Design a protein around this ligand. Structure first.
Ligand SMILES: COC1=CC(C)=C2[C@@H](Nc3ccc(O)c4c3C(=O)c3ccccc3C4=O)C#CCCC#C[C@H]1[C@@H]2C=O
Length: 462
């Protein structure tokens, strides 16, 4: 496919990309039909600060499906070690049908944007709720949704590499970006220079198995936070023991299921409240925020303005329906979900009830069960034939969203070309470089700049 060189221009100082460059790259909707329709994939670049030390391009993928990867470049400019920013053009992209790359709008209600985490009433009612999301999105975008897959994004990534005029390219990806990098190396690894995958999705869990295991991780994180909160009943007044704290949290969410809780003039229902809980759960540096909002909502008080500025971030003016549709296409389209409602009925009553905070939303009949198109391709198989010269895995020992088991699995599947750096003591998600750990950042920067993996898998302590 014809990949002309991008037309870089300074991003406006009225944008979150101020100080960077912006461009688009043309990709075909159907990579098998390169003369068919196309779309423009948005890019953002921070050029290497030192031409004499320039190694090439560090391509950066989105960290969640639907999350604009261009917005990672300012975060990376802020936190990356200086010699990395000296040596690489940092180039982030918004994956097809998200962000500024032809985002989709299908008329979804705000309640439907949270289809992943939606609390079910029963199998019958949730099957109706989730199928409705599918039929709504296919009514408005059924022409392109079959081309919103992880492998098609990986195809876009190689068009971008060629449009940038690079024979070899480096890659950094977090969470979903770790999977995009893995898939891209399996498909195009002969073009890989240095690769860092951080907070590593288990590539054998695509995707329902990941849903089910997340319910377990969430329970474990809630138990560690309930103990932490219990040790602080003298500030939060939620209980002097974890089960008492959990019971308060549980009842709060139960009321929110009945009646939306007014938070700074916006209704917060049980699904939204549980989502805010889980996001704050994922980093122990955010556990104080969680204590604050639970304390306030329980006692009918107001949360600190700082706490609300995290809530306004995830469900106020920032939020986008385009992200929910992007999640739908990737999560339902990469692999065929079980169609039989018996599977979901049983898993709700067993696994869901055993992991009650988010288990029911994870085990019940999700939109993928009702997908109207067959899978276009198998799930990418990672293995010994991966042609990437080297891949560094970076992983927090305690990560609620992408547990360390996924990184360990990737380390086995790609045993021939990977090394694993684990950060112990970290209750964190997305480590390099945003966590600011000197050990992790030094090791990852040395690899990116020398191309040398650690001699052995490393376990560092924060
Ligand atoms: C591959 O698809 C996904 C992978 C992972 C790990 C997903 C992960 N959610 C997140 C993982 C890391 C995050 O920082 C976040 C989120 C959010 O949900 C989120 C929602 C609203 C505001 C902020 C966040 C958020 O900050 C969880 C779970 C279960 C099923 C599915 C899928 C999506 C899904 C994120 O996209």
């Amino acid at each position: 496919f014809s990949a002309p060189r991008p037309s870089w221009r300074p991003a406006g100082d009225d944008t979150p990309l101020a100080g960077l460059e912006c461009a688009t790259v043309t990709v075909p909707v159907d990579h098998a039909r390169p003369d068919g329709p196309t779309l423009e994939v948005a890019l953002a670049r921070h050029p290497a600060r030192s031409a004499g030390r320039r190694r090439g391009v560090l391509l950066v993928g989105p960290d969640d499906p639907g999350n604009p990867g261009t917005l990672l470049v300012p975060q990376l400019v802020r936190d990356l070690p200086a010699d990395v920013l000296d040596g690489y053009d940092v180039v982030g992209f918004d994956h097809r049908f998200s962000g500024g790359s032809a985002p989709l709008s299908c008329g979804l209600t705000p309640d439907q944007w949270l289809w992943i985490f939606h609390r079910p009433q029963d199998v019958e009612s949730e099957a109706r709720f989730q199928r409705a999301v599918v039929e709504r999105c296919f009514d408005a975008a059924g022409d392109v949704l079959p081309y919103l897959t992880s492998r098609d994004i990986a195809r876009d990534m190689d068009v971008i590499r060629r449009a940038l005029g690079e024979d070899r390219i480096s890659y950094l990806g977090h969470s979903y970006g770790s999977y995009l990098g893995a898939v891209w190396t399996q498909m195009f690894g002969e073009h890989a220079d240095r690769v860092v995958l951080d907070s590593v999705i288990d590539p054998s869990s695509v995707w329902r198995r990941m849903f089910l295991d997340y319910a377990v991780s969430c329970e474990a994180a809630l138990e560690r936070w309930a103990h932490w909160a219990a040790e602080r009943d003298g500030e939060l007044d939620l209980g002097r023991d974890a089960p008492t704290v959990r019971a308060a949290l549980d009842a709060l969410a139960g009321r929110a299921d009945r009646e939306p809780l007014p938070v700074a003039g916006m209704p917060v229902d049980g699904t939204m409240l549980r989502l805010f809980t889980m996001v704050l759960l994922s980093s122990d540096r955010a556990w104080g925020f969680l204590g604050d909002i639970v304390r306030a909502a329980v006692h009918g008080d107001e949360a600190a303005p700082s706490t609300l500025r995290a809530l306004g971030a995830m469900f106020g003016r920032g939020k986008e329906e385009s992200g929910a549709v992007a999640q739908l296409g990737v999560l339902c389209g990469d692999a065929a979900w079980p169609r039989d409602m018996e599977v979901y009925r049983r898993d709700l009553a067993g696994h869901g009830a055993r992991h009650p905070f988010i288990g029911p939303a994870m085990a019940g009949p999700k939109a993928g069960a009702f997908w109207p198109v067959p899978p276009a391709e198998p799930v990418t198989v990672l293995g010994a034939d991966n042609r990437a010269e080297s891949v560094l895995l970076v992983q927090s020992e305690q990560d609620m969203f992408t547990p360390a088991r996924g990184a360990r699995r990737m380390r086995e599947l790609l045993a021939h070309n990977t090394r694993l750096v684990t950060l112990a003591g970290a209750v964190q998600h997305r480590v390099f470089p945003f966590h600011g750990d000197p050990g992790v950042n030094r090791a990852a920067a040395a690899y990116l700049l020398t191309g040398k993996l650690p001699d052995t898998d490393l376990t560092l302590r924060a």
